[PDB]
């Protein structure tokens, strides 16, 4: 929406900050054991209930 | 970048009318800023195609023919063109302002004015010419009305 | 800069366009011309380059009505490519 309340906006900000895979050096550090993040999502598929 | 998107904003035209010369294909990859596009426009490598205005030559010729009476016969009418209610408004104003002027100038006595006023309201007269003839035929004024 | 080694004039009959679906006729005619030139000049159909006036002539009446025939000039180049252009 165009007209957002700040509280909702800050929950959207948190989801934006967490939506990313582990860095490449983490994959190296863990010998490829850690390659995915549970916070990884796509805006079209996994919907936030914000 | 999409150079046509930037060029359209600068030229103030639609993207559908922005032309980029094929001779500037080498320089399209180097465009970064709108000022870069302004360089290409200045060199004549990007311009705007003139817009199309629908030509009215055929219409203007037809418009003259219709003024002479052509192409408005029975087979060319599909609905109502004459506003009957508007015609009444014009007919009343034409007749009333003529009769009210004659009374204001003293050429018509108020008794004769009232009879004609009610006869105009009663759809007795076809048009102003008919009203004038009636006035002249029945000597309702001292001098004939032109 | 490319030299011309052979020049010929052909009348290509496009009547086969009237035997295929109306929705593709002008595009089909482009394929007919490429196959014709490749056959008569012994090249692959992808080596045939069509001139702008020829392409415009085929499309002058939109996708449904290409002309029944085209009179073209064919030029073979020193490197084996072939150019086809409307005779005008």
């Amino acid at each position: 929406a165009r007209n957002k309340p700040l509280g909702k906006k800050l929950r959207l900000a948190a989801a934006l900050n967490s939506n990313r895979n582990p860095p490449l050096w983490v994959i190296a550090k863990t010998k490829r054991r850690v390659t995915r993040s549970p916070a990884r999502r796509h805006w079209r598929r996994q919907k936030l209930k914000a | 970048v999409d150079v046509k998107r930037l060029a359209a904003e600068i030229l103030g035209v639609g993207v559908s009318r922005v032309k980029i010369s094929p001779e500037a294909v080498g320089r399209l990859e180097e465009v970064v800023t709108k000022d870069d596009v302004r360089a290409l426009i200045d060199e004549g490598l990007i311009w705007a195609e003139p817009e199309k205005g629908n030509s009215r030559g055929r219409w203007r010729e037809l418009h003259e023919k219709k003024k002479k009476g052509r192409r408005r016969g029975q087979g060319s009418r599909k609905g109502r063109r004459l506003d009957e209610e508007e015609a009444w408004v014009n007919k009343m104003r034409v007749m009333r302002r003529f009769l009210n002027t004659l009374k204001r100038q003293g050429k018509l006595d108020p008794a004769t004015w009232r009879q004609l006023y009610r006869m105009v309201k009663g759809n007795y007269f076809r048009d102003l010419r008919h009203l004038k003839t009636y006035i002249n035929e029945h000597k309702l004024t001292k001098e004939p009305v032109k | 800069e490319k030299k011309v080694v052979l020049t010929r004039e052909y009348v290509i009959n496009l009547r086969r366009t009237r035997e295929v679906s109306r929705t593709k006729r002008a595009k089909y005619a482009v394929g007919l011309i490429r196959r014709f030139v490749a056959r008569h000049l012994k090249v692959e159909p992808k080596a045939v380059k069509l001139g702008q006036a020829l392409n415009e002539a085929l499309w002058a009446r939109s996708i449904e009505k290409p002309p029944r025939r085209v009179h073209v000039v064919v030029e073979k180049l020193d490197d084996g490519t072939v150019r086809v252009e409307l005779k005008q």
């Binding site: 909702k8 929950r11 209930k49 914000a50 | - | -």
Partner: protein, 52 residues
């Protein structure tokens, strides 16, 4: 109409939003209380023994 066409109308409204106390998407904005923890109608935390 009750199936796919009517699902089209679930695109713009809401019954619940996030609850400030428990954080779930369970605060009934019309009723003004949380369907999960009871915030807004109950100062004690809602939790029933029939729930595991």
């Amino acid at each position: 109409m009750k199936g796919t066409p009517s699902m089209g109308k679930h695109n713009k409204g809401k019954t619940h939003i996030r609850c400030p106390r428990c954080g779930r998407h369970s605060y009934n904005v019309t009723k003004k209380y949380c369907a999960s923890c009871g915030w807004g109608r109950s100062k004690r935390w809602r939790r029933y023994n029939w729930a595991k």
